[PDB]
Swiss-Prot record, chains A, B:
Its main location: virion. Residues 23-28, 88-191 are cytoplasmic. Plays a role in viral egress via lysosomal trafficking. Forms homotetrameric ion channels (viroporins) localized at endosomes and lysosomes, that may induce deacidification of lysosomes, allowing safe egress of virions via lysosomal trafficking. Also blocks autolysosome formation by binding and sequestering the host component VPS39 for homotypic fusion and protein sorting (HOPS) on late endosomes. This prevents fusion of autophagosomes with lysosomes, disrupting autophagy and facilitating virus egress. The chain holds residues 40 to 238 of 275 of the full protein. One of its GO terms (molecular function) is molecular function activator activity. The second or the third transmembrane region are responsible for Golgi localization. The record marks 94 as: Involved in polymerization. It is a multi-pass membrane protein. The chain crosses the membrane at residues 4-22, 29-54, 63-87. The keyword Cell membrane does not apply. Homodimer, a subset forms homotetramer of two homodimers linked non covalently. Interacts with M, S and E proteins. Also interacts with the accessory protein 7a. Interacts with host VPS39, sequestering it on late endosomes. Interacts with host HMGB1; the interaction enhances the association between HMGB1 and host BECN1, promoting reticulophagy. Interacts with HMOX1; the interaction promotes ORF3A-induced autophagy but is unlikely to be involved in ORF3A-mediated induction of reticulophagy. Residues 106-190 form the CoV 3a-like viroporin CD domain. GO terms for cellular component: cytoplasmic side of plasma membrane; extracellular region; host cell endoplasmic reticulum; host cell endoplasmic reticulum membrane; host cell endosome; host cell lysosome; host cell plasma membrane; plasma membrane. It comes from Severe acute respiratory syndrome coronavirus 2. This is ORF3a protein.
Length: 191, 191
């Protein structure tokens, strides 16, 4: 027999973790990971509060009005698992742990001798602007620590599509008037 | 008496909505709102699957090992409600519905005669680059439809802090080599 109290404690823990995750500021990197991890744990609890509940109906024998609902839940959870697998594949592609932490649709990526820069980015654009110097590379507020120079070619990675951007112009302090800040402009390649 | 089946159906609905929300692409505006709305509904269900469960313990009389946990849940939910109120206050401040849709920490905002542009932004930076022309204004991949010119002063809004950025240089196609694309550079004001 399956006691009902396990379902109650599981849903209580799920509520705790969901509420904790919903109020975490996503500003520093360690904040990004921890919150993400919490979601992962919460996801597991969700499975619990689903699967155990389903087992309860197995004890009840009233699965007829809920078999379709539980099948839909499992299908959506499988889709989420496939999404996580795609995220890991993207991480392997760009060789960085940033795509796990951020939820951006696209990632501007480029590899160097010592480091591989990965930066979140929302949507594909004709031009991309990279800002260097406060030194660090910032795009749309997302920041990566400076370790080397930038290559002439950068790649926008997604789940399925990849785009190439080539450096066209570089703006210095004198041409812009902003001290200790340099701008790099990349344009998409059509071929 | 409170039947247990309501808790089961509530947790099933909560699982359905959580799983549906976790697999929605955040690319188009209507996708952003709907997903957000789903979360809202899911949040309500969470309260249900908490509050009803608490009431069950009221029938049980075993609130002693869970009163602190439920108090923590309610405290976190109150914090989330205050966060939603702050989001609405930010919406009223910038006069746009974008901050409801996006989860960005900061928002670049500026008002015109006919429209008030609001664009998500991750963190405060010394310089901000605005890209115009494919016409639209894009920052970090986030896009707003063109309706008028840009003002010399823009404001980065947050929950509590506001920053000012002034236009310093404007880069045209000739100076950059990128056709039909214009760049605007804004620098922070210290005073």
């Amino acid at each position: 027999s399956l006691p009902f109290g396990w379902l109650i404690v599981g849903v209580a823990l799920l509520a705790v973790f969901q509420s904790a995750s919903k109020i975490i500021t996503l500003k520093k990197r360690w904040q990004l990971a921890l919150s993400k991890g919490v979601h992962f744990v919460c996801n597991l609890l969700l499975l619990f509060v689903t699967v155990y509940s389903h087992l309860l109906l197995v004890a009840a024998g009233l699965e007829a009005p809920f078999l379709y609902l539980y099948a839909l839940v499992y299908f959506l959870q499988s889709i989420n698992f496939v999404r996580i697998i795609m995220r890991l594949w993207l991480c392997w592609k760009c060789r960085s742990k940033n795509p796990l932490l951020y939820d951006a649709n696209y990632f501007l990526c480029w590899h160097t001798n010592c480091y591989d820069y990965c930066i979140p980015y929302n949507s594909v654009t004709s031009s991309i602007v990279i800002t260097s110097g406060d030194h660090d590379y910032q795009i749309g507020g997302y920041t990566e620590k400076w370790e080397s120079g930038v290559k002439d070619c950068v790649v926008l990675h997604s789940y399925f599509t990849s785009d190439y951007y080539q450096l066209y112009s570089t703006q210095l302090s004198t041409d812009t008037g902003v001290e200790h800040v340099t701008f790099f402009i990349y344009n998409k390649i059509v071929d």
